Scaffold this active site. Structure first.
Site, PDB file in Angstrom:
ATOM      1  N   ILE A 138       4.525  -0.265   0.452  1.00 36.17           N
ATOM      2  CA  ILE A 138       3.842  -1.536   0.660  1.00 36.17           C
ATOM      3  C   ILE A 138       2.610  -1.562  -0.234  1.00 36.17           C
ATOM      4  CG2 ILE A 138       2.844  -3.116   2.320  1.00 36.17           C
ATOM      5  CD1 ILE A 138       5.845  -2.477   2.658  1.00 36.17           C
ATOM      6  N   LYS A 139       2.434  -2.660  -0.953  1.00 37.17           N
ATOM      7  CA  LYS A 139       1.366  -2.795  -1.929  1.00 37.17           C
ATOM      8  C   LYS A 139       0.201  -3.560  -1.311  1.00 37.17           C
ATOM      9  CE  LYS A 139       2.047  -3.378  -6.577  1.00 37.17           C
ATOM     10  NZ  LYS A 139       2.219  -4.115  -7.889  1.00 37.17           N
ATOM     11  N   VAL A 140      -0.995  -2.965  -1.384  1.00 35.96           N
ATOM     12  CA  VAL A 140      -2.168  -3.446  -0.673  1.00 35.96           C
ATOM     13  C   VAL A 140      -3.331  -3.462  -1.655  1.00 35.96           C
ATOM     14  CG1 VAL A 140      -3.839  -2.886   1.115  1.00 35.96           C
ATOM     15  CG2 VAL A 140      -1.371  -2.464   1.540  1.00 35.96           C
TER      16      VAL A 140
END
Length: 352
Positions: A138-140
């Site tokens: 997941i890209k944050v």
């Protein structure tokens, strides 16, 4: 030629594709890339906006989803999660072959959550569960709230791609938050060996911001100097006794990932960023055209740690000119969030 990707692997760097689309996977092209040396995939809202706009295979999917009572965001998510899950399946053999160290696919949370740590945690947990693949990251965005969320997500055992980093200071904050989450899991007797985090540090945006007003000896040099200095910070942080005590217990180091590595100024060779940033325990995610250029006429050499002294001297001259790279980093992160939100709103409009 194509073997350059394998040559770069031997120097310790993975090359990922900075693109994703339904046709890239469905056509078999992504599977062929994973056999020929591509090691992973990154997406972001601009990548999906362009893919949804131009890839013919979305038309029937949008028509199907418009028959359902769904918000435009859920229509987008159903499409995007489906692409990511299909890409994860293609990359799974690679991922498992290295013990879970390679073969990742990244999906970014909604830009509107970037300053809301709890909202980010909630969406990241949800998207992790929705993709349902061990090789999804997941890209944050690496805002302060994003670094708060990173500690929690790591504590939850979730692999994360922390993005929109332009700051050595903020990157070090991310390492510290990662270590706190790892330490929490070890204290609770939980596994850590399959948790992978990358720190996506952006390159071309720095030169695009500064070059027009820099002296000539500095044009096209700041982003690489910043990256080289960031990598020296990385070596120092992760070899220190504090992290060694965690790595002895199975913790993985965070790895720097060079992003925004397509060259945007025609005054510079198109392989400048890829050629200049190769070093051990790193990743570089490249758009298709840069991957093509690097295969054709790139060079595989361990350039990232070369001439670190000159990198420091250049960053000292940047400060002498009054450019505060930390102020610049915050501005570039804010601009990138506005741009990602713009792209996201543009992709949602045809899904109403």
């Amino acid at each position: 030629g194509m073997t350059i990707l394998s040559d770069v692997k031997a120097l310790g760097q993975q090359i990922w594709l900075d693109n994703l689309s339904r046709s890239l996977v469905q056509s078999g092209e992504l599977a062929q890339m994973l056999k020929q040396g591509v090691c992973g995939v990154t997406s972001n809202p601009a990548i999906f906006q362009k893919a949804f706009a131009g890839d013919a295979l979305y038309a029937d999917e949008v028509a199907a989803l418009k028959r359902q009572n769904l918000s435009p965001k859920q229509r987008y998510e159903t499409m995007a999660v489906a692409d990511v899950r299909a890409a994860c399946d293609v990359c799974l053999a690679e991922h498992e072959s290295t013990g879970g160290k390679t073969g990742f696919v990244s999906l970014e949370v909604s830009p509107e959550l970037a300053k809301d740590a709890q909202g980010t945690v909630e969406e990241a947990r949800r998207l992790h569960a929705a993709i349902a693949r061990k090789n999804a990251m997941i890209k944050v965005p690496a805002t302060d709230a994003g670094i708060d969320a990173l500690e929690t997500l790591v504590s939850d055992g979730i692999s994360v791609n922390l993005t929109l980093l332009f700051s050595r200071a903020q990157t070090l904050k991310a390492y510290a938050a990662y270590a706190r989450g790892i330490a929490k899991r070890l204290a609770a007797g939980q596994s850590v060996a399959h948790i992978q985090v990358v720190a996506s540090f952006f390159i071309s945006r720095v030169d695009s911001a500064l070059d027009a007003t820099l002296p000539d000896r500095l044009k096209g040099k700041t982003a690489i100097a910043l990256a080289k200095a960031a990598y020296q910070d990385w070596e120092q942080y992760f070899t220190a006794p504090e992290f060694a005590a965690l790595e002895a217990q199975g913790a993985n180091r965070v790895q720097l990932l060079w992003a925004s590595t397509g060259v945007k100024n025609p005054a510079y060779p198109d392989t400048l960023y890829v050629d200049s940033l190769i070093g051990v325990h790193t990743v570089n995610t490249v758009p298709d055209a840069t991957l093509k250029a690097f295969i054709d006429h790139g060079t595989a050499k361990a350039t990232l740690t070369e001439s670190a002294d000159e990198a420091r001297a250049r960053l000292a001259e940047i400060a002498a000119l009054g450019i505060d790279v930390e102020t610049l980093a915050a501005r570039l992160q804010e601009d990138g969030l506005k741009q990602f939100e713009e792209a996201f709103e543009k992709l949602l409009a045809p899904l109403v």
